[PDB]
């Protein structure tokens, strides 16, 4: 259901200094914090209105750890670039994502911690919260490092523990932005390519969260394939959009429909023209 | 085990020092500590791999670390307060992981007196050796400066740690430039004392690669009992 | 900066008792905790390292407890011994840096059977040493610019506490060894 999650990325920068490191934190589908190796602040700036009221001890607290991260990333890149027998001027990436999610009962359901180097997978925490998966042999030892540093444990106790403990703290405080459901704004446009053919266009704007399914029927059949679907994309207010369209022989328009189903709508919305 | 040399070192205002620490095989993390008594302990720099992610803990610029497995620590411009025990520890990989500690390296600022010790071995009582029946053996080393004197007990050339005793704190003769004094004992059975050689040998750390210049150099000096 | 405290520096137990120290540390943003032992001058040793709430690890006769939300970590010693006598350190690790609470140091009091307080001599190789043996053990030696002693140290089947004393001028050192003792010489 709901979840609070941190994505981490540090990009190596050769011959021009410290690897850039971007840390950004999400709860549900919105963005509430940020840290940047090239930030003016050199500290953790709030990105969502509801979290700014958090204590002066908080931002100091958080900042302190996110630094520790970029330290460790500045470490990771290095202590990977020698595992893989690679140059100094390669400018590689390391990615870490971690976080916990909760049910409608609002308690621990899932824990994720995952880690990939220079793109494809490297190591990921099994959902066991007691074991690991090694994509490479290089990983399999990092596994064996953590397997002995008892690393599974600390993270587990964090995720089952204070990750959740704070996730509710966030939600209850950001009741306004997080717990809402703003049903999508539905629109439809016709744009011709010829007299021979035409292009019907299905618009869904201003919706939160972003997970939306909008489909498109001919007489009841899902014209699966002549249709084009585009990655659900963001906007201001931190709201989302998606767009789907097809070719429609002229005049046979009113045959075509559009179904926009979403958590904000009790039952799917049938969009027509018109 | 861990290795960390020089065991001790004494030098003066405005010169360099190289502090070695060799972690155990396969260690990957290293910590540098200094302790000013009686300030308490606080932490200076941690190293991982070959990289120093944090600096802003060791106090000033003269301090700077290099990692060369083994690594060194350099402070140019040895000055007044940089006068503490410098400790080095290693945990595999990982910060929270169990640290294992080096021997230790003392270091004292100053410019200047410095001299090696007396070693005089006393011998026990007419009647005490028959009182217990008990036997006993004493040692005593004074007139030296500065502290970096560690005791070695020898007998037949092979060391003994069974009954020996060294005092923990040195004895300032007074009270702030005055020099030191120490006293180690021993007890041995009495039939044992009838024609062997019980060595109270004492290590003073001077300078045996000559520095500016009654010598006085790394020496062992020893008083013997029968 | 966030604070750490231990309590207190100074414990003196009778070698039969048990003992507990009190390392405070914050609630928030905990990750790890460390307990260290520091005899005199020699290797400080990692004893336990505490990871999670609420664990209870023990080695031999040394034991320890972690509590996270309530900021504390107790450490118990069982069946105190001479060997134990050291200084104990708790460390607090969060965000890739360490925070040591002001040390807490342990000294036990070696109990001995059959005490015979004979103050033996001095030495020759012709100079002087004046001292005491046995003498256990809250009979505490404490002195005076040229009258020299040391206090004290303990041995090996039996243990002996002995405090050497020496001087030079005039006063000699045995009736002068008076600074306590009775029923001794």
């Amino acid at each position: 259901s709901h979840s609070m999650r941190y994505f981490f990325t540090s990009v190596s920068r050769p011959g021009r200094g410290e690897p850039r490191f971007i840390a950004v934190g999400y709860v549900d589908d919105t963005q509430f914090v940020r840290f940047d190796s090239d930030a003016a602040s050199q500290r953790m700036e709030p990105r969502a209105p509801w979290i700014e009221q958090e204590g002066p001890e908080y931002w100091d607290g958080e900042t302190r750890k996110v630094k520790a991260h970029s330290q460790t990333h500045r470490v990771d890149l290095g202590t990977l670039r020698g595992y893989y027998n690679q140059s100094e001027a390669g400018s590689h990436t390391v990615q870490r994502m971690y976080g916990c999610d909760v049910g409608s009962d609002w308690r621990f359901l899932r824990g994720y911690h995952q880690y990939a180097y220079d793109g494809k997978d490297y190591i990921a925490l099994k959902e066991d919260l007691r074991s690991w998966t090694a994509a490479d042999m290089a990983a399999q030892t990092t596994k064996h490092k953590w397997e002995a540093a008892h690393v599974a444990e600390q993270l587990r106790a964090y995720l089952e523990g204070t990750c959740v403990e704070w996730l509710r703290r966030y939600l209850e405080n950001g009741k306004e932005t997080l717990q809402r459901t703003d049903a999508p704004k539905t629109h439809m446009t016709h744009h011709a390519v010829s007299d021979h053919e035409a292009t019907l266009r299905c618009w869904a704007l201003s919706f939160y969260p972003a997970e939306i399914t909008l489909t498109w029927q001919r007489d009841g059949e899902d014209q699966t394939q002549d249709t084009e679907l585009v990655e659900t994309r963001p906007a201001g207010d931190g709201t989302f959009q998606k767009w789907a369209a097809v070719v429609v022989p002229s005049g046979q328009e009113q045959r075509y429909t559009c179904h926009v189903q979403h958590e904000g709508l009790p039952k799917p919305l049938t969009l027509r023209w018109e | 085990g861990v290795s960390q040399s020089p065991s001790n070192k004494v030098t003066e205002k405005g010169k360099d020092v190289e502090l070695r620490c060799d972690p155990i095989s396969g260690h990957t993390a290293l910590y540098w500590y200094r302790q000013r008594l009686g300030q308490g302990l606080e932490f200076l720099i941690y190293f991982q791999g070959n990289s120093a992610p944090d600096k802003s803990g060791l106090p000033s610029d003269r301090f700077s670390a290099e990692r060369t497995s083994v690594s060194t620590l350099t402070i140019q411009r040895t000055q007044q307060e940089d006068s503490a025990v410098y400790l080095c520890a290693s945990s595999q990989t990982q910060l929270w992981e169990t640290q294992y500690f080096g021997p230790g390296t003392r270091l004292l600022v100053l410019e200047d007196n410095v001299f090696p010790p007396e070693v005089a071995v006393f011998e026990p009582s007419e009647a005490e050796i028959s009182h217990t029946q008990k036997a006993t053996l004493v040692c005593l080393a004074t007139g030296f400066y500065p502290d970096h004197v560690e005791l070695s007990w020898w007998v037949n050339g092979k060391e003994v740690h069974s009954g020996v005793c060294t005092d923990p704190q040195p004895l300032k003769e007074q009270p702030n430039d005055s020099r030191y004094a120490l006293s180690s004992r021993l007890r041995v059975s009495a039939t044992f004392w009838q024609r062997n050689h019980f060595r109270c040998q004492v290590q003073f750390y001077g300078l045996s690669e000559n520095d500016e210049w009654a010598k006085p150099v790394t020496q062992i000096v020893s008083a013997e009992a029968w | 900066i966030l604070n750490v405290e231990q309590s207190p520096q100074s414990l003196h137990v009778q070698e039969g008792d048990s003992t507990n120290f009190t390392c405070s540390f914050p609630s928030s943003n905990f990750y790890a905790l460390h307990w260290y032992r520091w005899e005199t001058a020699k290797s400080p040793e990692a004893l336990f390292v505490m990871t999670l709430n609420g664990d209870e690890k023990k080695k031999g006769r040394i034991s320890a407890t972690l509590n996270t939300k309530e900021g504390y970590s107790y450490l118990y010693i069982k069946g105190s011994q001479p060997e134990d006598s050291a200084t104990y350190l708790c460390a607090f690790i969060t965000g890739n840096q360490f925070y040591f609470g002001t040390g807490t140091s342990l000294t036990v009091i070696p109990n001995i059977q059959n005490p015979d307080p004979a103050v033996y001599q001095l030495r020759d190789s012709d100079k002087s040493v004046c001292l005491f043996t046995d003498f256990d053990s809250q009979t505490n030696v404490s002195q005076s610019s040229d009258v020299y002693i040391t206090d004290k140290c303990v041995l090996d089947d039996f243990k002996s506490n002995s405090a050497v004393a020496w001087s030079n001028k005039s006063d000699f050192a045995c009736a002068n060894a008076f600074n306590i003792p009775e029923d001794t010489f």
Binding site: Y6, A68, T72, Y83, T142, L155 | - | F30
Partner: peptide, 9 residues
């Protein structure tokens, strides 16, 4: 609240 501290490889 980020995890107080992570590991490395």
């Amino acid at each position: 609240n980020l995890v107080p501290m992570v590991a490395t490889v």
